[PDB]
């Protein structure tokens, strides 16, 4: 019982906490006592489901008011007060790497954890090594070690914190660790996981995507009402449109989207976040749902009436769509979303990217029409999703087990 103790230091915000909680549950399944180290003032952000999951899952609260100097102090006292067994390792979100030196002084091996895909980290590193910053228009710079379709164009240099060609933040965040765990699986990003391993010279394992277990609030409509609507449309006829909660297109571009949906004959669900497309809901009758508030994204993506996903290509949305075989129409806005869009459209070939500044109504009608009619990407998306039906991907299960073998020798 309890082969060892493994600590985990999550990052709170941007969707880093839940992946970490899922990684805790998966690690504990290998007979490890996993402890999540958090600031006390955020204790409420952890559901009772995690605390009472099992006797191998624990939460330690470091007393913090509400910068992170108090954290480091409390982590120091916590490690020094422990009377248990020396922990086998600590898993630190790369965004919490400032605390690495504390666990190094206590002689605890440090494992880095990235909650996003490997493609964005790998392409970011490659762009920096290929000095894409000095690219000229019309030039195309392939990244050695990565697929040719990921080659950088001068247009890629514009992405609405570190820009293309700059040293990505993960390099120094991972420096000092003995291994790197990424929230992905070989089925999704094999070539980029390997690239990450070859450049860092550390073992890199894909132990995700760490999605809610169901994968295997205020709103315009209710869950049952949305399903009712989906049940009334033909198979794979609905395009789900959502830019998440962080960022979105310009107001001018949103109007173009509105005009496109009004002219087209395609059923759609358009989720909007605090703009409003007035009165699109009236003009289109029941061909479209304009959901204000939050929408049941997992229900929508898993419904057989959903045949496309217009997404900003954030990693979580991308992984959910891939796991359900819903092709993506990529409208990336910021950060890693651009490399995620390249992944689906050019590497995995399970989607397309909006093309042809600012996108016009015609560009949006063309892109929605091309995606929903593309039988190749639909067949490819469904084929790839078969690896995600029946349970956690086998690659992630073996990868995590390979990691457990590594940190225990």
């Amino acid at each position: 019982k309890a082969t060892g103790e493994i600590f985990v230091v999550p990052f709170f915000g941007q969707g880093h906490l839940f992946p970490a909680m899922e990684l805790c549950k998966n690690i504990s399944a290998h007979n490890y006592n996993v402890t999540l180290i958090i600031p006390s003032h955020l204790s409420s952000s952890i559901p009772s489901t995690f605390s009472n999951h099992s006797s191998f899952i624990h939460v330690t609260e470091i007393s913090v008011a509400a910068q992170n100097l108090q954290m480091g102090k409390g982590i120091k006292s916590f490690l020094s007060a422990r009377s248990g067994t020396r922990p086998t390792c600590v898993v630190i979100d790369v965004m919490m790497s400032w605390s690495k030196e504390i666990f190094v002084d206590h002689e605890i091996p440090v494992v880095s954890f990235s909650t996003s895909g490997a493609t964005a980290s790998a392409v970011g590193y490659g762009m920096w090594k290929a000095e894409v910053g000095n690219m000229k228009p019309g030039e195309i710079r392939e990244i050695p070690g990565l697929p040719k379709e990921m080659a950088v164009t001068f247009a890629d240099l514009s992405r609405g914190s570190p820009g293309p060609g700059q040293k990505p933040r993960w390099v120094d965040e991972v420096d000092g660790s003995i291994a790197l765990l990424i929230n992905t699986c070989d089925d999704l990003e094999h070539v980029f996981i390997n690239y990450m391993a070859e450049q860092t010279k550390l073992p890199v394992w894909g132990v995700g995507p760490l999605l809610p277990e169901q994968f295997w609030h205020k709103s315009n409509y209710t869950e049952d009402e949305v399903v009712q609507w989906l049940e009334s449309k033909p198979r794979e006829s609905v395009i789900y449109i959502s830019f998440g909660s962080e960022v979105g297109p310009t107001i001018e571009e949103y109007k173009e989207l509105a005009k496109a949906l009004e002219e087209s004959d395609q059923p759609f669900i358009w989720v909007i976040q605090p703009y409003y497309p007035d009165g699109l809901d009236v003009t289109v009758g029941n061909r479209g749902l304009i959901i204000t508030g939050w929408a049941p994204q997992l229900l929508i993506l898993s419904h057989p009436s959903t045949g496309g996903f217009l997404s900003h290509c954030g990693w979580n949305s991308t992984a959910e769509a891939i796991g359900r075989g819903v092709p993506i129409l990529g409208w990336p806005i910021r950060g890693d979303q651009f490399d995620n869009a390249k992944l689906v459209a050019y590497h995995l070939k399970i989607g397309h990217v909006m093309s042809r500044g600012k996108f016009t109504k015609d560009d949006i009608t063309s892109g929605i029409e091309k995606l929903m009619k593309d039988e190749k990407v639909h067949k490819q998306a469904k084929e790839l999703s078969k690896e995600f039906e029946g349970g956690f991907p086998v690659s992630s299960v073996k990868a995590l087990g390979a990691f457990v073998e590594f940190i225990s020798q």
Side-chain angles (χ1 to χ4, degrees):
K1 169 162 302 320
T3 294
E5 308 263 326
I6 294 179
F7 298 166
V8 174
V9 181
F11 181 71
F12 288 79
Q14 296 171 222
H16 293 234
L17 174 51
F18 276 75
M21 304 204 272
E22 304 291 353
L23 179 71
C24 288
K25 296 151 118 137
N26 297 347
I27 291 175
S28 63
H30 289 80
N31 192 231
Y32 273 92
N33 231 45
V34 183
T35 306
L36 200 76
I37 293 160
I38 74 180
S40 59
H41 60 91
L42 307 174
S43 158
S44 53
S45 288
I46 295 102
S48 289
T49 322
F50 182 77
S51 317
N52 296 39
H53 171 253
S54 88
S55 65
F56 290 93
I57 292 287
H58 309 268
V59 173
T60 295
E61 298 179 1
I62 274 47
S63 275
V64 173
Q67 284 298 323
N68 60 32
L69 177 61
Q70 268 207 277
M71 256 290 260
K73 302 281 224 71
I75 297 169
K76 251 296 193 220
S77 295
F78 158 70
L79 295 172
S80 293
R82 269 187 52 83
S83 68
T85 325
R86 268 213 182 60
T88 314
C89 77
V90 58
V91 181
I92 309 187
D93 194 314
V94 285
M95 312 207 55
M96 297 297 285
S97 63
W98 59 263
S99 70
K100 197 195 234 74
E101 35 170 7
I102 297 174
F103 297 94
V104 166
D105 301 338
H106 276 259
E107 324 211 279
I108 302 169
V110 175
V111 172
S112 285
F113 176 49
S114 179
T115 65
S116 60
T119 296
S121 293
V123 170
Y125 184 91
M127 285 184 310
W128 170 58
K129 213 199 216 180
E131 296 176 26
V132 296
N134 64 36
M135 267 178 72
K136 279 150 204 279
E139 217 176 314
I140 291 169
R141 201 162 287 174
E142 305 185 4
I143 298 168
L146 290 188
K148 262 142 145 170
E149 71 262 20
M150 311 300 281
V152 175
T153 74
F154 180 85
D156 296 331
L157 271 47
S158 289
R159 303 197 162 169
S161 175
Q166 313 258 82
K167 193 185 188 183
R169 297 200 118 99
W170 69 257
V171 178
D172 292 327
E173 292 169 338
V174 173
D175 178 284
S177 302
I178 56 158
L180 172 62
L181 305 175
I182 304 176
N183 188 24
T184 189
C185 69
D186 287 295
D187 301 285
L188 297 175
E189 302 177 300
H190 177 62
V191 172
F192 309 95
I193 299 168
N194 192 245
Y195 183 89
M196 290 297 301
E198 314 245 49
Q199 300 293 345
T200 70
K201 290 297 161 28
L202 307 165
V204 183
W205 285 290
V207 302
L210 297 157
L211 294 183
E213 297 170 29
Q214 47 268 49
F215 189 88
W216 296 284
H217 325 83
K218 204 185 164 190
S219 176
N220 236 15
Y221 301 92
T222 81
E223 282 178 36
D224 317 54
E225 288 178 339
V226 172
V227 167
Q228 251 186 292
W229 184 86
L230 290 162
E231 292 290 325
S232 72
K233 305 307 184 180
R235 298 145 299 153
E236 308 189 349
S237 66
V238 169
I239 184 148
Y240 174 60
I241 301 163
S242 177
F243 291 91
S245 50
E246 293 176 345
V247 281
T250 69
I251 268 69
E252 178 173 5
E253 291 172 295
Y254 267 141
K255 293 159 167 158
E256 299 299 299
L257 181 53
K259 293 190 292 181
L261 304 178
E262 169 172 316
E263 293 184 351
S264 112
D265 314 279
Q266 197 83 53
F268 68 88
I269 288 164
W270 182 5
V271 188
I272 164 175
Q273 197 70 300
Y275 177 70
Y276 178 91
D278 18 80
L280 180 69
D281 55 348
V282 156
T283 322
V284 305
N286 63 27
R287 181 170 55 87
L289 283 192
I290 290 75
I291 306 184
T292 54
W294 94 291
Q297 168 155 310
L298 187 270
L299 281 172
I300 292 162
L301 287 170
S302 65
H303 198 273
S305 294
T306 305
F309 182 16
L310 203 180
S311 176
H312 67 306
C313 294
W315 182 239
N316 208 77
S317 285
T318 300
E320 285 182 353
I322 296 174
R324 295 294 169 164
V326 174
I328 279 169
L329 170 57
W331 192 329
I333 306 292
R334 77 178 317 217
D336 83 314
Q337 293 159 23
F338 290 94
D339 295 315
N340 296 342
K342 272 154 162 242
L343 174 74
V344 316
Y346 302 146
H347 186 60
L348 298 174
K349 305 191 187 59
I350 55 183
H352 300 127
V353 305
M354 284 264 87
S355 60
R356 307 170 51 189
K358 272 190 205 95
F359 293 126
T360 69
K361 164 183 84 184
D362 290 333
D363 298 331
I364 294 166
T365 284
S366 173
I368 289 169
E369 195 181 323
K370 175 171 182 47
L371 185 278
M372 305 295 282
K373 269 151 171 274
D374 192 325
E375 58 182 83
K376 198 176 171 234
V377 306
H378 274 91
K379 183 199 201 275
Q380 184 66 57
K382 177 74 205 298
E383 188 65 32
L384 182 55
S385 80
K386 78 197 208 136
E387 313 294 337
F388 297 81
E389 59 199 42
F392 212 61
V394 189
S395 51
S396 308
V397 172
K398 289 213 146 135
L400 180 68
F403 165 78
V404 180
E405 293 163 1
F406 170 69
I407 46 65
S408 88
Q409 69 190 20

Short mmCIF file of all heavy atoms in Angstrom, two decimals, residues 310-352:
data_model
loop_
_atom_site.label_atom_id
_atom_site.label_comp_id
_atom_site.label_asym_id
_atom_site.label_seq_id
_atom_site.Cartn_x
_atom_site.Cartn_y
_atom_site.Cartn_z
N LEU A 310 -16.83 25.35 -35.45
CA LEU A 310 -16.09 26.59 -35.68
C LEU A 310 -15.48 27.04 -34.35
O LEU A 310 -16.18 27.53 -33.46
CB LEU A 310 -17.00 27.67 -36.24
CG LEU A 310 -16.31 28.79 -37.03
CD1 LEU A 310 -17.35 29.82 -37.53
CD2 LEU A 310 -15.25 29.50 -36.22
N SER A 311 -14.17 26.85 -34.21
CA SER A 311 -13.50 26.97 -32.92
C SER A 311 -12.31 27.91 -33.03
O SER A 311 -11.71 28.06 -34.09
CB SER A 311 -13.02 25.59 -32.42
OG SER A 311 -12.30 25.70 -31.21
N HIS A 312 -12.00 28.56 -31.90
CA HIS A 312 -10.77 29.33 -31.79
C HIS A 312 -9.56 28.42 -31.61
O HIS A 312 -8.44 28.91 -31.55
CB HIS A 312 -10.85 30.32 -30.62
CG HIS A 312 -10.92 29.66 -29.27
ND1 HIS A 312 -11.87 28.71 -28.95
CD2 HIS A 312 -10.17 29.84 -28.16
CE1 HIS A 312 -11.69 28.33 -27.70
NE2 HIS A 312 -10.65 28.98 -27.21
N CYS A 313 -9.78 27.10 -31.53
CA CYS A 313 -8.71 26.11 -31.46
C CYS A 313 -7.89 26.20 -30.19
O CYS A 313 -6.70 25.88 -30.18
CB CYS A 313 -7.81 26.21 -32.69
SG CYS A 313 -8.65 25.79 -34.21
N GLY A 314 -8.49 26.64 -29.09
CA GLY A 314 -7.88 26.39 -27.80
C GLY A 314 -7.74 24.89 -27.57
O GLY A 314 -8.52 24.09 -28.07
N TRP A 315 -6.72 24.53 -26.81
CA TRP A 315 -6.35 23.12 -26.72
C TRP A 315 -7.50 22.26 -26.21
O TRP A 315 -7.80 21.20 -26.78
CB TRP A 315 -5.14 22.93 -25.82
CG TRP A 315 -4.73 21.49 -25.76
CD1 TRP A 315 -4.66 20.70 -24.66
CD2 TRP A 315 -4.35 20.66 -26.88
NE1 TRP A 315 -4.25 19.44 -25.01
CE2 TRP A 315 -4.05 19.39 -26.36
CE3 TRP A 315 -4.24 20.88 -28.25
CZ2 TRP A 315 -3.63 18.32 -27.17
CZ3 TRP A 315 -3.81 19.82 -29.07
CH2 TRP A 315 -3.51 18.55 -28.51
N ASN A 316 -8.15 22.70 -25.14
CA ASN A 316 -9.26 21.93 -24.58
C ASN A 316 -10.36 21.70 -25.62
O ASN A 316 -10.84 20.57 -25.80
CB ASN A 316 -9.82 22.63 -23.35
CG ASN A 316 -10.44 21.66 -22.37
OD1 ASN A 316 -9.72 20.97 -21.63
ND2 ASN A 316 -11.78 21.59 -22.36
N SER A 317 -10.77 22.76 -26.33
CA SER A 317 -11.82 22.59 -27.33
C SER A 317 -11.34 21.68 -28.45
O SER A 317 -12.11 20.84 -28.94
CB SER A 317 -12.25 23.94 -27.89
OG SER A 317 -13.05 24.65 -26.96
N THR A 318 -10.08 21.82 -28.85
CA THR A 318 -9.55 20.99 -29.92
C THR A 318 -9.59 19.52 -29.53
O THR A 318 -10.06 18.67 -30.30
CB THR A 318 -8.11 21.41 -30.25
OG1 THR A 318 -8.08 22.78 -30.67
CG2 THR A 318 -7.50 20.56 -31.36
N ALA A 319 -9.11 19.20 -28.33
CA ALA A 319 -9.03 17.81 -27.91
C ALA A 319 -10.42 17.21 -27.79
O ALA A 319 -10.64 16.05 -28.18
CB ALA A 319 -8.27 17.69 -26.59
N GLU A 320 -11.38 17.98 -27.28
CA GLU A 320 -12.75 17.47 -27.15
C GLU A 320 -13.33 17.15 -28.52
O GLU A 320 -13.97 16.10 -28.71
CB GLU A 320 -13.63 18.48 -26.42
CG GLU A 320 -13.40 18.56 -24.93
CD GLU A 320 -14.33 19.55 -24.27
OE1 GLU A 320 -15.05 20.26 -25.01
OE2 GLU A 320 -14.34 19.60 -23.02
N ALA A 321 -13.14 18.05 -29.49
CA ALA A 321 -13.69 17.81 -30.82
C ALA A 321 -13.03 16.59 -31.47
O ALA A 321 -13.71 15.78 -32.12
CB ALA A 321 -13.50 19.05 -31.70
N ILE A 322 -11.72 16.46 -31.32
CA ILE A 322 -11.03 15.33 -31.93
C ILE A 322 -11.53 14.04 -31.33
O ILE A 322 -11.76 13.05 -32.03
CB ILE A 322 -9.51 15.48 -31.78
CG1 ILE A 322 -9.04 16.72 -32.55
CG2 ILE A 322 -8.79 14.22 -32.25
CD1 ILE A 322 -7.55 17.04 -32.32
N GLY A 323 -11.73 14.02 -30.01
CA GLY A 323 -12.21 12.82 -29.35
C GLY A 323 -13.61 12.43 -29.76
O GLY A 323 -14.02 11.30 -29.51
N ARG A 324 -14.35 13.35 -30.37
CA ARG A 324 -15.71 13.08 -30.80
C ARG A 324 -15.84 12.97 -32.32
O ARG A 324 -16.95 12.75 -32.81
CB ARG A 324 -16.65 14.17 -30.26
CG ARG A 324 -16.77 14.19 -28.72
CD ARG A 324 -17.45 12.92 -28.23
NE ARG A 324 -17.35 12.77 -26.79
CZ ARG A 324 -18.09 11.95 -26.06
NH1 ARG A 324 -19.01 11.18 -26.62
NH2 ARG A 324 -17.90 11.90 -24.74
N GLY A 325 -14.76 13.15 -33.06
CA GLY A 325 -14.83 13.05 -34.51
C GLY A 325 -15.57 14.17 -35.19
O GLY A 325 -16.09 13.96 -36.29
N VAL A 326 -15.62 15.35 -34.59
CA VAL A 326 -16.26 16.52 -35.17
C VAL A 326 -15.18 17.36 -35.85
O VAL A 326 -14.31 17.90 -35.15
CB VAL A 326 -17.00 17.35 -34.11
CG1 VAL A 326 -17.52 18.65 -34.73
CG2 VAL A 326 -18.13 16.54 -33.48
N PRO A 327 -15.19 17.49 -37.18
CA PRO A 327 -14.15 18.31 -37.83
C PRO A 327 -14.21 19.76 -37.36
O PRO A 327 -15.27 20.27 -37.00
CB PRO A 327 -14.48 18.20 -39.32
CG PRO A 327 -15.33 16.95 -39.45
CD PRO A 327 -16.12 16.87 -38.13
N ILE A 328 -13.05 20.41 -37.37
CA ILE A 328 -12.89 21.78 -36.87
C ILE A 328 -12.71 22.74 -38.04
O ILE A 328 -11.98 22.46 -38.99
CB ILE A 328 -11.69 21.87 -35.91
CG1 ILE A 328 -12.08 21.39 -34.51
CG2 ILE A 328 -11.14 23.27 -35.87
CD1 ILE A 328 -10.91 21.19 -33.58
N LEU A 329 -13.41 23.86 -37.97
CA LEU A 329 -13.14 25.01 -38.82
C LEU A 329 -12.44 26.02 -37.94
O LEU A 329 -13.08 26.62 -37.06
CB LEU A 329 -14.42 25.60 -39.42
CG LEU A 329 -14.26 26.94 -40.14
CD1 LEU A 329 -13.25 26.86 -41.25
CD2 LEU A 329 -15.62 27.40 -40.67
N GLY A 330 -11.14 26.21 -38.16
CA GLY A 330 -10.30 26.95 -37.24
C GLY A 330 -10.33 28.45 -37.47
O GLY A 330 -10.07 28.92 -38.58
N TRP A 331 -10.61 29.17 -36.40
CA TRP A 331 -10.55 30.63 -36.39
C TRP A 331 -9.70 31.05 -35.21
O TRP A 331 -10.20 31.67 -34.25
CB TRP A 331 -11.96 31.22 -36.32
CG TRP A 331 -12.03 32.71 -36.59
CD1 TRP A 331 -11.08 33.65 -36.33
CD2 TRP A 331 -13.13 33.41 -37.19
NE1 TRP A 331 -11.52 34.89 -36.71
CE2 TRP A 331 -12.77 34.77 -37.25
CE3 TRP A 331 -14.38 33.03 -37.68
CZ2 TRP A 331 -13.61 35.74 -37.77
CZ3 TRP A 331 -15.20 33.99 -38.20
CH2 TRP A 331 -14.82 35.33 -38.25
N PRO A 332 -8.40 30.74 -35.24
CA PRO A 332 -7.54 31.03 -34.09
C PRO A 332 -7.37 32.52 -33.88
O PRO A 332 -7.41 33.30 -34.83
CB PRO A 332 -6.20 30.37 -34.44
CG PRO A 332 -6.21 30.32 -35.98
CD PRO A 332 -7.67 30.08 -36.35
N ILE A 333 -7.21 32.92 -32.62
CA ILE A 333 -7.17 34.32 -32.23
C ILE A 333 -5.86 34.68 -31.55
O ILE A 333 -5.29 35.74 -31.83
CB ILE A 333 -8.36 34.67 -31.31
CG1 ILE A 333 -9.69 34.27 -31.96
CG2 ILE A 333 -8.33 36.15 -30.95
CD1 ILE A 333 -10.05 35.08 -33.18
N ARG A 334 -5.37 33.83 -30.65
CA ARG A 334 -4.22 34.22 -29.85
C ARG A 334 -3.40 33.00 -29.45
O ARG A 334 -3.93 31.91 -29.24
CB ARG A 334 -4.65 34.98 -28.58
CG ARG A 334 -5.20 34.08 -27.49
CD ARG A 334 -5.58 34.85 -26.19
NE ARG A 334 -4.55 35.83 -25.87
CZ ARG A 334 -4.17 36.13 -24.64
NH1 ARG A 334 -4.65 35.48 -23.60
NH2 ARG A 334 -3.24 37.07 -24.46
N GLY A 335 -2.09 33.21 -29.32
CA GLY A 335 -1.22 32.26 -28.66
C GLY A 335 -1.14 30.93 -29.38
O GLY A 335 -1.00 30.86 -30.61
N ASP A 336 -1.25 29.85 -28.60
CA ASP A 336 -1.08 28.50 -29.11
C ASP A 336 -2.18 28.11 -30.09
O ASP A 336 -2.05 27.09 -30.77
CB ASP A 336 -1.02 27.50 -27.95
CG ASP A 336 -2.39 27.10 -27.43
OD1 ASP A 336 -3.26 27.99 -27.23
OD2 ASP A 336 -2.63 25.87 -27.25
N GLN A 337 -3.24 28.92 -30.19
CA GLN A 337 -4.37 28.55 -31.03
C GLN A 337 -3.97 28.46 -32.50
O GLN A 337 -4.59 27.71 -33.27
CB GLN A 337 -5.50 29.57 -30.86
CG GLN A 337 -6.13 29.55 -29.48
CD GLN A 337 -6.87 30.83 -29.13
OE1 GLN A 337 -7.31 31.60 -30.00
NE2 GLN A 337 -6.99 31.07 -27.83
N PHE A 338 -2.96 29.22 -32.93
CA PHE A 338 -2.55 29.18 -34.33
C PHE A 338 -1.86 27.86 -34.67
O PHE A 338 -2.10 27.28 -35.74
CB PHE A 338 -1.63 30.38 -34.65
CG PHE A 338 -2.34 31.70 -34.65
CD1 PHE A 338 -2.37 32.49 -33.52
CD2 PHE A 338 -2.99 32.14 -35.78
CE1 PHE A 338 -3.05 33.69 -33.52
CE2 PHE A 338 -3.66 33.33 -35.79
CZ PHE A 338 -3.70 34.11 -34.65
N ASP A 339 -0.98 27.38 -33.80
CA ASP A 339 -0.34 26.09 -34.02
C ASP A 339 -1.32 24.94 -33.86
O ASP A 339 -1.17 23.91 -34.54
CB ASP A 339 0.83 25.95 -33.06
CG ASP A 339 1.93 26.97 -33.34
OD1 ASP A 339 2.27 27.14 -34.54
OD2 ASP A 339 2.45 27.59 -32.38
N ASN A 340 -2.33 25.07 -32.99
CA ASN A 340 -3.36 24.04 -32.90
C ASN A 340 -4.16 23.96 -34.19
O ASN A 340 -4.58 22.88 -34.62
CB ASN A 340 -4.28 24.30 -31.72
CG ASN A 340 -3.56 24.21 -30.39
OD1 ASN A 340 -2.46 23.64 -30.30
ND2 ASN A 340 -4.16 24.78 -29.35
N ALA A 341 -4.42 25.11 -34.82
CA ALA A 341 -5.16 25.11 -36.08
C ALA A 341 -4.36 24.41 -37.18
O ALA A 341 -4.92 23.66 -37.98
CB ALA A 341 -5.50 26.54 -36.49
N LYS A 342 -3.06 24.67 -37.25
CA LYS A 342 -2.23 23.97 -38.21
C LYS A 342 -2.28 22.46 -37.97
O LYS A 342 -2.29 21.67 -38.92
CB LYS A 342 -0.79 24.48 -38.12
CG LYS A 342 -0.49 25.68 -38.99
CD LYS A 342 0.65 26.49 -38.41
CE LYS A 342 1.28 27.41 -39.42
NZ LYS A 342 2.73 27.06 -39.63
N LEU A 343 -2.32 22.05 -36.70
CA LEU A 343 -2.35 20.62 -36.39
C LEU A 343 -3.56 19.95 -37.02
O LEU A 343 -3.43 18.88 -37.63
CB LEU A 343 -2.37 20.43 -34.87
CG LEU A 343 -2.55 19.01 -34.35
CD1 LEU A 343 -1.28 18.19 -34.53
CD2 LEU A 343 -2.94 19.06 -32.88
N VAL A 344 -4.75 20.55 -36.88
CA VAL A 344 -5.96 19.87 -37.33
C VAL A 344 -6.06 19.93 -38.85
O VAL A 344 -6.40 18.94 -39.50
CB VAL A 344 -7.22 20.44 -36.66
CG1 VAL A 344 -7.02 20.67 -35.16
CG2 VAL A 344 -7.65 21.71 -37.32
N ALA A 345 -5.73 21.07 -39.43
CA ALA A 345 -5.96 21.25 -40.86
C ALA A 345 -4.86 20.65 -41.72
O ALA A 345 -5.14 20.13 -42.81
CB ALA A 345 -6.11 22.73 -41.19
N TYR A 346 -3.61 20.69 -41.26
CA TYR A 346 -2.47 20.33 -42.10
C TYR A 346 -1.76 19.06 -41.67
O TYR A 346 -1.26 18.34 -42.54
CB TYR A 346 -1.46 21.48 -42.12
CG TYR A 346 -2.04 22.79 -42.62
CD1 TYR A 346 -1.60 24.01 -42.10
CD2 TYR A 346 -3.01 22.81 -43.61
CE1 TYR A 346 -2.11 25.21 -42.57
CE2 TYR A 346 -3.54 23.99 -44.08
CZ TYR A 346 -3.09 25.20 -43.56
OH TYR A 346 -3.63 26.39 -44.03
N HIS A 347 -1.68 18.77 -40.38
CA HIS A 347 -1.00 17.57 -39.92
C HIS A 347 -1.97 16.40 -39.77
O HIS A 347 -1.82 15.38 -40.45
CB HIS A 347 -0.29 17.84 -38.59
CG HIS A 347 0.55 16.69 -38.11
ND1 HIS A 347 1.61 16.19 -38.85
CD2 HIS A 347 0.50 15.96 -36.98
CE1 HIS A 347 2.17 15.20 -38.18
NE2 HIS A 347 1.52 15.03 -37.05
N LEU A 348 -2.97 16.54 -38.91
CA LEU A 348 -3.96 15.48 -38.74
C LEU A 348 -4.98 15.45 -39.88
O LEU A 348 -5.51 14.38 -40.21
CB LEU A 348 -4.70 15.65 -37.41
CG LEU A 348 -3.82 15.55 -36.17
CD1 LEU A 348 -4.62 15.87 -34.92
CD2 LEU A 348 -3.19 14.17 -36.07
N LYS A 349 -5.24 16.60 -40.51
CA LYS A 349 -6.16 16.69 -41.65
C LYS A 349 -7.58 16.29 -41.24
O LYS A 349 -8.22 15.46 -41.88
CB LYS A 349 -5.68 15.86 -42.83
CG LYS A 349 -4.26 16.18 -43.28
CD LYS A 349 -3.94 15.52 -44.61
CE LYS A 349 -2.48 15.70 -44.98
NZ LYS A 349 -1.55 15.14 -43.94
N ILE A 350 -8.06 16.92 -40.18
CA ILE A 350 -9.39 16.65 -39.64
C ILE A 350 -10.12 17.98 -39.50
O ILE A 350 -11.03 18.12 -38.68
CB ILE A 350 -9.30 15.93 -38.28
CG1 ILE A 350 -8.43 16.74 -37.31
CG2 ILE A 350 -8.77 14.53 -38.44
CD1 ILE A 350 -8.25 16.05 -35.96
N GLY A 351 -9.71 18.97 -40.29
CA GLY A 351 -10.39 20.25 -40.26
C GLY A 351 -9.79 21.19 -41.28
O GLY A 351 -8.96 20.81 -42.09
N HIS A 352 -10.25 22.44 -41.24
CA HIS A 352 -9.73 23.48 -42.10
C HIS A 352 -9.54 24.74 -41.28
O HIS A 352 -10.05 24.84 -40.16
CB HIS A 352 -10.66 23.77 -43.28
CG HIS A 352 -10.92 22.58 -44.15
ND1 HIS A 352 -12.19 22.16 -44.48
CD2 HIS A 352 -10.07 21.74 -44.79
CE1 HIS A 352 -12.11 21.11 -45.26
NE2 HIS A 352 -10.84 20.83 -45.47
#
